[PDB]
């Protein structure tokens, strides 16, 4: 039945060789295949029988194996390579009678860092008066111009970590090739008054940027 | 050419049934296994099943068996996936795929050819137009919070498209409510007009909102 493990993320600079591991209980007597998927697109087969490349897949991608661990190596890694990689094998359990199964890895997100690190501009907006005569309250935290495209957002009532109404988008590539994301804090006009200040704290690569608002 | 062409996107209310298709062309449909894989938005690939067109031999993921049914129609080279009763957690993108046999001293198999994916959304949302709220303002952030709309998309322009630079418009949040919202901010160098134009053609809502700062 067993499970394939890959690391969830890998990050490399253009040119560095990227390495993605895949482990599992019977992997050593099992052929491993590797797949690429660019988000929004269909998977693409990069590698079958551990080490063989389908016609059209370039030589700088190579597959190898050692014990229960399969590895995919990408050299001359460039931005086009960014996306998700999945290993897959088969399992045949008796459990009498033979039960067939296609096994996928959880997938590995490859990032290629193609520009210097850049901190986000944070903008926190308070509920508009319009939105207030409608008996809803929305805090709008806009996070822009950051690189690379990964952040975490913490919300805060005075200094209390809140989680009710918190909706946050996955970062997405802007016009200028830096990232954006947005977090929403949905409250009642009662809770908006119910506290002195509200906090949005974006953490990007270990540094954090805080904006704060207050009624009214 | 040699391809797998899947049927179009689907929006269904829970409890409805559904049959999506996968039409092969350019090779002998009977002689390779067809697989089916699901991918929930922003998660990995999930095996559903394989089926051998020639005779309809099938193997299922224990996660899907009986929830969903595989079938083919050889007369037209089509594979199918069928639900009797949809549920919220069936939402996702479904791919079909062909298993290829690579032969030699060592024979193996792998999924070489893939459909483009069928999106399925199971929702009880009914169409809703958005409310538009102003987001009053070196640089200065302003904008419009476009609120509670179904379905996608809304487009948003400024000054009737007259104003393009300093315009970012956000991916949209599919709030737990089952309705989307987004916002569109313009960072600028005031005294000048500044109007955000929101268009949500699914409901034919056009809203022009004046943005000015706290009096």
């Amino acid at each position: 039945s067993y499970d394939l493990t890959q690391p969830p993320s890998v990050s490399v600079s253009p040119g560095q060789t990227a390495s993605i591991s895949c482990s599992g209980d019977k992997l050593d007597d099992k052929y491993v295949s590797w797949y690429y998927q660019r988000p929004g697109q269909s998977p693409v087969l990069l590698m079958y029988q551990d080490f063989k490349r389908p016609s059209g897949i370039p030589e700088r991608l190579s597959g190898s194996k050692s014990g229960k661990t399969a590895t995919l190596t990408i050299s001359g890694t460039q931005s086009l390579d960014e996306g998700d990689y999945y290993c897959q094998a088969w399992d045949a359990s008796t459990g009498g009678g033979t039960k067939l199964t296609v096994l996928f890895g959880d997938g590995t997100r490859l990032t290629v860092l193609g520009q210097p690190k850049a901190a986000p501009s944070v903008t926190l907006f308070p509920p508009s008066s319009e939105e207030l005569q409608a008996n809803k309250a929305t805090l709008v935290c806009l996070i822009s111009d950051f690189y690379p495209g990964a952040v975490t957002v913490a919300w805060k009532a005075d200094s209390s970590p809140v989680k009710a109404g918190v909706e946050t988008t996955t970062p997405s590539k802007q016009s200028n090739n830096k990232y954006a994301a947005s977090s929403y804090l949905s409250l009642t006009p009662e809770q908006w008054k119910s506290h002195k200040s509200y906090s949005c704290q974006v953490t990007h690569e270990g540094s954090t940027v805080e904006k704060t608002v207050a009624p009214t | 050419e040699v391809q797998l062409v899947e049927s179009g996107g689907e929006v269904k209310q829970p409890g409805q049934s559904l049959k999506i298709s996968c039409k092969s062309s350019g090779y002998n449909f009977l002689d390779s296994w067809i697989g089916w894989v699901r991918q929930i938005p922003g998660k990995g690939l999930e095996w559903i099943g394989i089926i051998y067109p020639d005779d309809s031999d099938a193997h299922y993921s224990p996660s899907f068996e009986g929830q969903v049914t595989m079938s083919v129609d050889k007369s037209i080279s089509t594979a199918y996936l069928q639900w009797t009763t949809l549920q919220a957690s069936d939402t996702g993108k479904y791919f079909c795929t062909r298993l290829y046999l690579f032969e030699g001293a060592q024979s193996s198999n792998a999924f070489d050819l893939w459909g483009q994916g069928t999106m399925i959304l199971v929702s009880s949302g009914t169409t809703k137009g958005p409310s538009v709220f102003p987001l009053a303002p070196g640089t200065a952030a302003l904008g419009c919070l476009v609120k509670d709309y179904f379905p996608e998309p809304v487009t948003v322009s400024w000054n009737s498209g007259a104003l393009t630079s300093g315009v970012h418009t956000f991916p949209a949040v599919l709030q737990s409510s089952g309705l989307y919202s987004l916002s569109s901010v313009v960072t600028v160098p005031g005294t000048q007009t500044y109007i955000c134009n929101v268009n949500h053609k699914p409901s034919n809502t056009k809203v022009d909102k004046k943005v000015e700062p706290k009096s």
């Binding site: 099992k30 | 390779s32 051998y52 024979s107 198999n109």
Partner: peptide, 14 residues
């Protein structure tokens, strides 16, 4: 046969 599924070296079905 083309119904062949191979899991590994010497491990095959159909």
């Amino acid at each position: 046969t083309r119904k062949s599924i191979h899991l590994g070296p010497g491990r095959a079905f159909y």
